[PDB]
Structure 1
Amino acid sequence: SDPLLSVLMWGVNHSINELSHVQIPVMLMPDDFKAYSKIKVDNHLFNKENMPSHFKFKEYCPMVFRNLRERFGIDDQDFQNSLTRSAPLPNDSQARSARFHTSYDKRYIIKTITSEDVAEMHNILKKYHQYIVECHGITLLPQFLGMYRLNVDGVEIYVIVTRNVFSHRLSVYRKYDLKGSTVAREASDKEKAKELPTLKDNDFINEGQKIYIDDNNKKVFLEKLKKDVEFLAQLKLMDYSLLVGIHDVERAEAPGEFDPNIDVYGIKCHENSPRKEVYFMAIIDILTTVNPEQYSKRFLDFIGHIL
Structure 2
Amino acid sequence: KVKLFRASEPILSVLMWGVNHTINELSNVPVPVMLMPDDFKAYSKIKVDNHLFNKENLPSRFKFKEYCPMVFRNLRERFGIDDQDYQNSVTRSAPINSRFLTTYDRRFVIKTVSSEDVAEMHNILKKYHQFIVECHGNTLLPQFLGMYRLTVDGVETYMVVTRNVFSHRLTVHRKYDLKGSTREASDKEKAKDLPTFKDNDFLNEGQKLHVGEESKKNFLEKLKRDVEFLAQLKIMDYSLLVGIHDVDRAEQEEMEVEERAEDGPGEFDPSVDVYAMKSHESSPKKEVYFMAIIDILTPEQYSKRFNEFMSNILT
> TM exceeds 0.5?
yes
Partners of 1:267 and 1:304 in 2: CA distance: 15
Q: 1:27 corresponds to which residue?
A: 34
Q: 1:277 corresponds to which residue?
A: 287
Q: Return the offset for 1:44.
A: 1.6
Q: 2:64 corresponds to which residue?
A: 57
Matches of residues 130-149 of structure 1 in structure 2 within 5 Å?
130-149=130-149
Alpha-carbon displacement from aligned partner over 1:163-201 (angstroms, at most 9, x marks no partner): 00000111110111000112xx00111111111111000
Letter in 2 for 1:152: V
Alpha-carbon displacement from aligned partner over 1:281-307 (angstroms, at most 9, x marks no partner): 00000013xxx1111111011111221
What is the TM-score normalised by the length of structure 2? 0.92
Partners of 1:47 and 1:138 in 2: CA distance: 43
Letter in 1 for 2:281: E
Q: 1:213 corresponds to which residue?
A: 211
Q: 1:242 corresponds to which residue?
A: 240
Partners of 2:106 and 2:313 in 1: CA distance: 28
User: Aligned pair 1:17/2:24, yes or no?
Assistant: yes
What is the TM-score normalised by the length of structure 1? 0.95
Letter in 2 for 1:204: F
Matches of residues 1-307 of structure 1 in structure 2 within 5 Å?
1-91=8-98, 99-182=99-182, 185-253=183-251, 254-288=264-298, 292-307=299-314
Q: Return the offset for 1:46.
A: 2.0
Letter in 1 for 2:303: S
Moved more, 24-33 or 144-153: 24-33
Partners of 1:142 and 1:256 in 2: CA distance: 24
Partners of 2:187 and 2:203 in 1: CA distance: 16
Moved more, 211-220 or 155-164: 211-220
Q: Return the offset for 1:90.
A: 2.0
Q: 2:260 corresponds to which residue?
A: none
Moved over 6 A (4+): none
Partners of 2:46 and 2:76 in 1: CA distance: 22
- Identity within the alignment, %: 81
Partners of 1:168 and 1:224 in 2: CA distance: 22
Letter in 2 for 1:119: A
**3-state DSSP class of the match of 1:138?**
coil
The unaligned stretches of length 5 or more in structure 2 are 1-7, 252-263
Partners of 1:43 and 1:83 in 2: CA distance: 22
Moved more, 135-144 or 208-217: 208-217
Alpha-carbon displacement from aligned partner over 1:20-59 (angstroms, at most 9, x marks no partner): 1111023100000010000000112222212111100000
Partners of 2:168 and 2:61 in 1: CA distance: 34
